[PDB]
Design an enzyme around this catalytic site. Structure first.
Site, short mmCIF file in Angstrom:
data_model
loop_
_atom_site.label_atom_id
_atom_site.label_comp_id
_atom_site.label_asym_id
_atom_site.label_seq_id
_atom_site.Cartn_x
_atom_site.Cartn_y
_atom_site.Cartn_z
N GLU B 166 0.81 -1.31 -0.03
CA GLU B 166 0.12 -0.16 0.14
C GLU B 166 0.71 1.23 -0.11
O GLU B 166 0.63 2.08 0.83
CB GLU B 166 -1.12 0.08 1.16
CG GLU B 166 -1.79 -1.38 1.32
CD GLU B 166 -2.74 -1.21 2.46
OE1 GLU B 166 -2.39 -0.75 3.55
OE2 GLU B 166 -3.82 -1.60 2.37
N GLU B 374 -5.05 -8.56 1.46
CA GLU B 374 -5.61 -8.09 2.56
C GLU B 374 -7.32 -8.05 2.34
O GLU B 374 -7.58 -7.48 1.30
CB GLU B 374 -5.22 -6.81 2.84
CG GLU B 374 -4.19 -6.86 3.78
CD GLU B 374 -3.56 -5.25 4.30
OE1 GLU B 374 -2.45 -5.07 4.59
OE2 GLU B 374 -4.37 -4.54 4.75
O1 LIG Z 1 -9.26 0.13 10.04
P1 LIG Z 1 -8.07 0.53 10.59
O2 LIG Z 1 -8.01 0.25 11.96
O3 LIG Z 1 -7.69 1.90 10.39
O4 LIG Z 1 -6.84 -0.53 9.74
C1 LIG Z 1 -6.98 -0.50 8.00
C2 LIG Z 1 -5.97 -1.90 7.78
O5 LIG Z 1 -5.95 -2.19 6.62
C3 LIG Z 1 -4.89 -1.41 5.79
O6 LIG Z 1 -5.03 -0.10 5.62
C4 LIG Z 1 -3.73 -1.47 6.52
O7 LIG Z 1 -2.88 -2.53 5.39
C5 LIG Z 1 -3.62 -2.19 7.71
O8 LIG Z 1 -2.39 -2.52 8.28
C6 LIG Z 1 -4.70 -1.56 8.48
O9 LIG Z 1 -4.66 -2.47 9.83
#
Ligand SMILES: O=P(O)(O)OC[C@H]1O[C@@H](O)[C@H](O)[C@@H](O)[C@@H]1O
Ligand SMILES: O=P(O)(O)OC[C@H]1O[C@@H](O)[C@H](O)[C@@H](O)[C@@H]1O
Lengths: 474, 474
Positions: B166, B374
């Site tokens: 990302e 992810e």
């Molecule tokens: O919903 P949050 O807590 O802001 O996290 C977003 C998650 O999704 C992504 O943005 C990141 O790769 C992750 O590291 C992160 O944990």
């Protein structure tokens, strides 16, 4: 703050041989599939056909003089294959070539750039008789021989060339909707002929590199950019299918040499995908064009279409606004009226911003220069006393589209030129004469042929001023 | 009739070193930019940081056994660069490499495929101190030294690698929004750092082809596919701007080595385009990845945004729904609530069909295989007496997304695997601990580490069943 149109912008206007020439059997011209098709009863509005059309074959000198009066930088026309090879693949007719030679000389003598379209839907009937025309790989080498003949004869004088004009239209109308020769309604045949046309396009671009090394060439795609109806995810997915199925299916082959994968798989699951021979992909991928020709008139809004849903809809023949109905592919998408644009009385969308969108999509996806080969508004014109045709409607349509082009150029799209459709009024393939596109009114209607005299419309003078001010005054 | 998930489909789960490891100053580890940033007052919720996180550094054996119980086919994790090079580019910390060795050995001894992420946002502070980290070309060769160190040590045992995770987030959050280190709000600096990271990415893919010839490598892009609000042409045009500026700006470089023209020209018109050195385009174009990694959570809907309109918006870090406000770029687009989908309490849209749309767009535009690195749902969990966590909301979200992946595979998209975010609960960069993503609940909150004990949630057993049936039973 807008960029100006580049100094050598090809301000153009366009026609198509069958739609304008006439002389359908003079000086040795053979029969084309439209000669035969248009005389079948009930095909065309009130039996209109191209025996005479607007008789440009005999009146071209008056026609080119009006172009020079207007100050056209370019004129795009199609060469009638059956004038050059009456048989398609036999001896060359020197009288046929000689007419196009006389036309080009007339154009150059007035400082007008010729843009030669190779194929605008008029394959010689003999080739349909001998082997089904676009359904046989034999048309690849016959079309090449014809194209090479024109390249050798006019290459020294013609920089810009267009291969196949609106391949998606004559394939679709000719083999799926049955509205064009050969009048077929068969999707398996449609995609076979489409694939053969793709190879024919690729073969002649390859020849062009040999014979006209300093020329520029490309196919011209009838582009209706797709819109999703709303941000409903199902509607956006329908837009993904529609743009890939209606548009990328052709433009990815032109630009990249390959069909899009999802559409291919869907065709495969139906047994509709084309037959591929060794060497096809190599040829298709080795034929990069200098530009993407674009014929634009409207955008299309789509929505989700269930597996049970819309197929062929109802085309607007009449002019009674509202008579069209949604057309679709079950499971993928169906069209729907865009509530945020106006339509003509033929239910065609008036969407000049859609042109900018479409130009941006082509540059963003292919990084190709773009030649706008066709854009125009068809409407009834009244001839008023004093040789006055006040087509303010036509001026309003062209102005907004030209404005959006300039915005596209400011965004960074490389637009080579713009060919309004059309220079004179001409014969519509199916709808006769009363839906006019010309800057120059031609004195005939569906019943009376009259004298075919040319009369300058108001739009003629509007566009004269656009060319004079290189687009600064619109 | 849906295609099955391929027989070697990587059913996975994922984490990131800072979010999970703890042991921030153990075994020779140096400081990362996040060790420093999170301890600055006001940077993180309730001052939470990664000093301990959920202590996966000491507890990795327990965690891997839980992965094995679930039957995970793959586990994606990131390597902490500051464990390997405490000062970023000096001598290697053997104890740091030895942890990831023990981790990979533990995974392979349980038949789990490791997927190594090289960079998940934690550049060592010493490189930020020496030359400003991603803002200097010095980082290209330093990041390469580090990647090759990992390639040589683990390439025999790790087939699947991710380069930058990302890049669009840590660059724009670090240099445009000021919400991540180094806390800069400067668009010019943002695009310079972005360009340097593009070069670093290409450089290590190039090195990978030499050191791991049989491995597969790609970057992972935080992909929110854009939607127009409706078929209004100005809104479709904002969609074209949004998709090119937010998504193609990164993925075109990753796939084609080229920035898109319209976005480049808009940045140039503002003095914001990055400085390009001789040989940059050559490097960027000669580093094709094996796959595009995709981190997906939601789609984004956009409408027209006038030149005086919306810029930065309010983000939702609390959990009270309806707090977020529109964000955009004046004159190009602004976001708007998609009325046809639900949102989470943090205002993230729930759009599993958007995943199908995004996967379709990537295959259609780049023809690349896709590794979903992810995907997950972040929500408050209640630990009920008897160590029970019923997270049916999480099952429902994962189920519908995995369903849409199968529809995408059926369309023809080549999806290599699916890594749910996350395996265990972990520390959110800004949001603290209560917004949980894990299959495995970790007993701690923002105020106490408690005993950090691992508690299988209901979604653990649902995913276990998904993997056992290769996804036939969702
Ligand atoms: O919903 P949050 O807590 O802001 O996290 C977003 C998650 O999704 C992504 O943005 C990141 O790769 C992750 O590291 C992160 O944990
Ligand atoms: O049916 P209409 O309204 O006359 O439109 C026909 C025009 O539409 C275009 O698709 C064709 O390229 C032109 O050749 C033709 O003139």
């Amino acid at each position: 703050h807008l960029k100006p149109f580049p100094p050598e912008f090809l301000w153009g206007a366009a026609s198509a041989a069958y739609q304008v020439e006439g002389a359908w059997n003079e000086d040795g011209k053979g029969l084309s599939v439209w000669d035969v098709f248009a005389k079948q009863p009930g095909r065309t509005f009130k039996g209109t056909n191209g025996d005479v059309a607007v008789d440009h074959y005999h009146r071209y000198q008056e026609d080119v003089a009006l172009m020079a009066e207007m100050g056209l930088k370019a004129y795009r026309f199609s060469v009638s294959w059956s004038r050059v090879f009456p048989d398609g693949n036999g001896a060359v007719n020197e009288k046929g070539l000689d007419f196009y030679d006389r036309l080009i000389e007339e154009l150059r003598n007035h400082g007008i750039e010729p843009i030669v379209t190779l194929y605008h839907w008029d394959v010689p009937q003999a080739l349909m008789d001998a082997y089904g025309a676009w359904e046989s790989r034999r048309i690849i080498d016959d079309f090449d021989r014809y194209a090479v003949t024109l390249f050798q004869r006019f290459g020294d004088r013609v920089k810009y060339w267009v291969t196949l004009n609106e391949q998606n239209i004559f394939i679709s109308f000719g083999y799926r909707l049955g509205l064009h020769p050969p009048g077929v309604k068969d999707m398996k045949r449609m995609y076979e002929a489409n694939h053969i046309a793709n190879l024919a396009n690729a073969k002649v671009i390859q020849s062009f590199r040999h014979y006209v090394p300093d020329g520029k060439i490309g196919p011209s795609f009838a582009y209706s950019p797709m819109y999703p109806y709303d941000s409903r995810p199902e509607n956006v997915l329908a837009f993904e299918n529609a743009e890939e199925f209606q548009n990328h299916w052709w433009m990815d082959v032109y630009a990249w040499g390959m069909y899009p994968q999802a559409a291919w798989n869907y065709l495969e699951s139906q047994g509709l995908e084309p037959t591929v021979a060794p060497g096809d992909w190599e040829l298709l991928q080795a034929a990069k064009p200098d530009f993407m020709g674009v014929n634009y008139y409207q955008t299309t809004t789509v929505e989700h279409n269930p597996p049970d849903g819309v197929g062929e809809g109802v085309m607007n023949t009449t002019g009674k606004k509202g008579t069209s109905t949604s057309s679709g592919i079950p499971g993928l998408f169906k069209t729907v009226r865009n509530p945020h644009v106006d339509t003509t009385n033929w239910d065609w969308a008036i969407d000049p911003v859609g042109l900018r969108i479409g130009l941006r999509r082509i540059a963003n996806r292919y990084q190709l220069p773009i030649l706008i080969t066709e854009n125009g508004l068809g409407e009834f014109d009244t001839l008023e006393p004093g040789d006055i045709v006040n087509d303010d409607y036509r001026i309003d349509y062209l102005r907004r589209h030209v404005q959006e082009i300039q915005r596209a150029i400011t965004d960074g799209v490389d637009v080579l030129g713009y060919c309004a459709w059309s220079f004179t009024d001409l014969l519509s393939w199916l709808n006769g004469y009363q839906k006019r596109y010309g800057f120059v009114y031609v004195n005939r209607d569906d019943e009376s042929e009259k004298d075919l005299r040319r009369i300058k419309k108001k739009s003629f003078y509007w566009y004269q001023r656009v060319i004079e001010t290189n687009g600064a005054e619109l």
